[PDB]
Design an enzyme around this catalytic site. Structure first.
Site, PDB file in Angstrom:
ATOM      1  N   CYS B 161      79.916  -3.628  75.266  1.00 42.95           N
ATOM      2  CA  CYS B 161      80.125  -4.890  75.953  1.00 42.95           C
ATOM      3  C   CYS B 161      79.016  -5.899  75.765  1.00 42.95           C
ATOM      4  CB  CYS B 161      80.265  -4.669  77.466  1.00 42.95           C
ATOM      5  SG  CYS B 161      81.118  -3.164  77.836  1.00 42.95           S
ATOM      6  N   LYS B 328      85.910 -13.059  83.142  1.00 43.56           N
ATOM      7  CA  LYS B 328      86.794 -12.014  82.627  1.00 43.56           C
ATOM      8  C   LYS B 328      88.078 -11.908  83.442  1.00 43.56           C
ATOM      9  CE  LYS B 328      83.364  -9.075  80.404  1.00 43.56           C
ATOM     10  NZ  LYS B 328      82.147  -9.764  80.808  1.00 43.56           N
ATOM     11  N   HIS B 333      88.305  -8.590  78.774  1.00 45.09           N
ATOM     12  CA  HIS B 333      87.052  -8.126  78.235  1.00 45.09           C
ATOM     13  C   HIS B 333      87.255  -7.892  76.749  1.00 45.09           C
ATOM     14  CE1 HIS B 333      83.399  -6.273  77.607  1.00 45.09           C
ATOM     15  NE2 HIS B 333      83.563  -5.117  78.220  1.00 45.09           N
TER      16      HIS B 333
HETATM   17 NA    NA Z   1      78.516 -12.724  81.359  1.00 44.06          NA
END
Ligand code: NA
Ligand code: NA
Lengths: 407, 407
Positions: B161, B328, B333
C-alpha cells in the site's frame, strides 16, 4: 556523507548454501547449473537452471514460513546468516536506526499461479489467507522486516537484473546521508517454471547446452546462447563506519561507489552508453584502481558485448583493464538475487585473494580477445577495489564498487 | 538539501481518467466503486471493485503496448498526462538529470497467470516473447523508462500500500541530495481477479455491501468490513525548485516532509507505533501546521483505528487536529497506485480550496467520535500543508507532506 561498510553477509546460491560453500565453488569453478527436468517436461527450449540445494524447513520454522514464498524463504536464511556473520544482537537488528531494502525481480509467481489455479478448481477461499505477502512485489522486505522486527526503513526496490544492486546502493545512500545506521540489503528470487517460462518464451535462456547443463552458462564464449536462470538470495549488513568500528564489527569491505542510470532505449537489450554512464557514476567517488570487475555478463549474444565495449571505453583493453570474470557462468542469473550475490562473491574473492575463472569459455568470442577475461583462476592477488555491474531489463543499470577497508 | 516541487500530475483512477474528472469526483463525493460481476462469477466473498474507465488503446499505441500490462498502460497514460501538465519538452523528459521511480504493489498477475495457463494448454512458446517486462516487479519503471527514454535513475520501489508514497519519497530524496533534478514518481496497479482473489481469500475486502457497491468503502464507518480494491496509476513530476522556477513551471506544491518506517510487528495489521514514528519523521522537517490529513484508512476494522490513534497521539483530537478525509471511501485501494493518487487528490484539494467528504459514513464508529473526520465537504478552505499516509502490508509505512509554494 558517512562511510559505509559491509559487516556481514549471507547467501543462498546455486553455488552454495553459505559463504564457505560459495567460496569453494568460486575457487574450484564448480558450476551450479544442472538439468531442469521439469522444463523439459513442460516443453521449454531451455532445460537448465541454477537451483539452490538447501533444506528450508530445517532452517526456517513453520510459523516463520507462513508468509514466505520459496525465494523469500531463501532470503530469510540469508538474513539469518548475515545477522550471525555480523554478530548482531537482537537490539542491533531491531531498532529505529536499522532498516531493510530487500527486493526481488518478481514476487512468488508460483503463489500467483497456484492461487489462480486453486481459485478455478476449488474456489477462492482455497487460496488460503496467506498468499498476499508472497505474491506482492515487496515480499522480500515485507516478510523479513516483519519477522526480524525491523523498525527503520522497509521497502523493496525492483529493477530486474539490477534489483539487489539498487537495493544495496539505496541502502548505502540511506546510511551515507545519516537516515539509518544499519541496513540489511539484498534480494532474492524463487526459481520456478512459472517465472522461467517467461524467459524461455522470449528465447532468452540457453538451450544449446541442455546435454551438458553444467557448462550452459558461458559468458564471453563465442557460442553462448542465452542466460541460465537461477534462484537464491543474498543479504549484506551495511553499517556506517563509526557504528561498525564501535562494536568491533567485521568489515568485509567499504562501499565506495554506486552508479544508477537508465538506457531509455530497449526493453531487453542494453544500449551500452547507459552502462558507461553507470560505471562512471560509480567510479566518480572511487580513488583507487579497480582490481576486478564482476560484470553483468549473463551469457547472451546481445548482452555480453555492449558491456565489454563499455568497459573498454572506461578502462581500456588488455593489461591495463581490470581482470573480468563472469560469475554467472558458474551461478546462472538469479535475477533479484544477482546483484547482492555478486557483491558477496566479489567480497569473498577479495577476502580470499583470488579471482575466479570466468568459467566455461571453451572458445572465447574473438570480439573479446583484447580483454582481460580471466581464463584460469588467479591466485595470490591483493584485491583492494572491486566493481560489480548489473544491467537489467528495462534499461536499468546499477554498479557498485567495494573497497578493502584499510582506514 | 534542495527544495523539491511538484510540477505536473497525471492520474488514472476509479474516480476519474484525468485530474479534472478526479477533482469533480472529490468535490461531489462520487464513488468510483462498482459491482465486480467477475468476482461473483468466481465465487468471491467481495464483489466490488474500483475500476478505471479509460480507453487504453486510444491513448497508448500498439507498439507502445507491446510490453505493458494493463496497470503499466494506465501508468503510461498517467505519465503522458504528467508530462503534458508539466509542459516538458522531450529534452526535459529524456536527460541524465531526469529519472523515474515508479512502482506497483504487484506486477501483472494476469500476465503471470495467462502465461502459466497457455504454457500448459498450448506450450511455452505460446506465452509469447513479451511477457517478462509485464510480469516483473519493476514493470512500471522498466516500461516507462524505456518508452520515455529516461536516462537517469530507473527503478521501482514496492511496499504494498505504501509503494508509490515511497516512490515519491525516494524521488524527493534523489532531488534533495542533488542526484537528479527531475523525477517522474508514482506507481500503478492493474485491477484483476488474479490479484484481487488473494485479498478475498484472506477476507480483507468488503463483502457486506455487495448490494450497494458504491458505498462499500467506508473508512471510519462503524460497519466497515474491509477494503475495496482498485486499479489505476498516478505520476508526479518532481523538480528541484530552481529547475522549476527557471523554466516557469507550474508548482502544485512543495514536498516538505517524508517519513518511512517499519512496524516490525504483524504482516497484515498495523502496529500503530510505526505510523506515529512515520508521521513524526515526515513532520520533522515541516514548519507549518497541517491543514488536511489524507489517511491510509482503507475501510478495515483493524486498520482504520490504529492510524486514528496515531493521529491522536501526534495531533490530538477535535478541532486542533487537522481535518481527516479518507479518499479511499470514494476510490477504493489501488495498492501500488494509492500513494501517488492520494498525493494528487490532496494537491487537487489544495488547488481547489476544499476538503472532500470522508464518504459513506452512515454511522461513524464511536471510537472516532472525537476526531475531525470530514462528514461534509468543506469549502473555502485555504489548504497550505497536507499530509498523506500509506501504511502497507509488511508493516511498511510512508508519509508525505506537501505544502503550497509561496516562496
Ligand atoms: Na493517504
Ligand atoms: Na556483477
Amino acid at each position: 556523507m558517512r562511510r559505509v561498510v559491509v559487516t556481514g553477509m549471507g547467501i543462498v546460491s546455486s553455488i552454495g548454501s553459505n559463504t564457505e560453500e560459495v567460496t569453494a565453488s568460486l575457487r574450484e569453478a564448480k558450476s551450479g547449473i544442472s538439468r531442469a527436468e521439469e522444463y523439459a517436461e513442460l516443453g521449454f527450449r531451455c532445460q537448465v537452471h541454477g537451483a539452490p540445494d538447501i533444506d528450508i524447513e530445517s532452517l526456517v520454522d513453520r510459523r516463520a514460513m507462513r508468509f514466505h514464498g520459496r525465494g523469500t524463504a531463501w532470503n530469510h536464511i540469508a538474513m539469518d546468516q548475515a545477522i550471525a556473520d555480523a554478530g548482531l544482537t537482537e537490539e542491533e537488528v531491531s531498532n529505529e536506526r536499522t532498516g531493510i531494502i530487500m527486493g526481488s525481480g518478481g514476487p512468488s509467481t508460483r503463489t500467483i499461479v497456484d492461487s489462480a489455479d486453486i481459485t478455478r478448481e476449488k474456489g477462492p477461499k482455497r487460496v488460503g489467507p496467506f498468499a498476499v505477502p508472497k505474491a506482492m512485489s515487496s515480499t522480500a522486505s515485507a516478510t523479513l522486516a516483519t519477522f526480524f522486527k525491523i523498525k527503520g526503513i522497509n521497502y523493496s526496490i525492483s529493477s530486474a537484473c539490477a534489483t539487489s544492486n539498487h537495493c544495496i546502493g539505496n541502502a548505502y545512500e540511506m546510511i551515507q546521508y545519516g537516515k539509518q545506521d544499519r541496513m540489511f540489503a539484498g534480494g532474492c528470487e524463487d526459481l520456478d517454471w512459472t517465472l522461467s517460462v517467461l524467459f524461455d518464451a522470449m528465447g532468452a535462456m540457453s538451450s544449446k547446452y541442455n546435454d551438458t547443463p553444467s557448462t550452459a552458462s558461458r559468458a564471453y564464449d563465442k557460442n553462448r546462447d542465452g542466460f541460465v536462470i537461477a534462484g537464491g538470495a543474498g543479504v549484506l549488513v551495511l553499517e556506517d563506519l563509526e557504528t561498525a568500528l564501535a562494536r568491533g564489527a567485521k568489515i568485509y569491505g567499504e562501499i565506495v561507489g554506486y552508479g544508477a542510470t537508465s538506457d531509455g532505449y530497449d526493453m531487453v537489450a542494453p544500449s551500452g552508453e547507459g552502462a558507461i554512464r553507470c560505471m562512471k557514476m560509480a567510479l566518480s567517488t572511487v580513488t583507487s584502481k579497480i582490481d576486478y570487475i564482476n560484470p553483468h555478463a549473463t551469457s547472451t549474444p546481445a548482452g555480453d558485448a555492449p558491456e565489454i565495449e563499455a568497459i573498454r571505453q572506461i578502462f581500456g583493453a588488455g593489461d591495463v583493464c581490470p581482470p573480468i570474470a563472469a560469475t554467472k557462468s558458474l551461478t546462472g542469473h538469479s535475477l533479484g538475487a544477482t546483484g547482492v550475490q555478486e557483491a558477496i562473491y566479489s567480497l569473498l574473492m577479495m577476502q580470499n585473494n583470488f579471482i575466479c575463472e570466468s568459467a566455461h569459455i571453451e572458445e572465447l568470442d574473438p570480439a573479446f580477445a583484447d580483454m582481460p577475461i580471466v581464463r584460469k583462476r588467479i591466485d595470490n592477488v591483493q584485491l583492494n577495489t572491486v566493481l560489480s555491474n548489473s544491467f537489467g531489463f528495462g534499461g536499468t543499470n546499477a554498479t557498485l564498487v567495494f573497497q578493502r577497508y584499510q582506514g
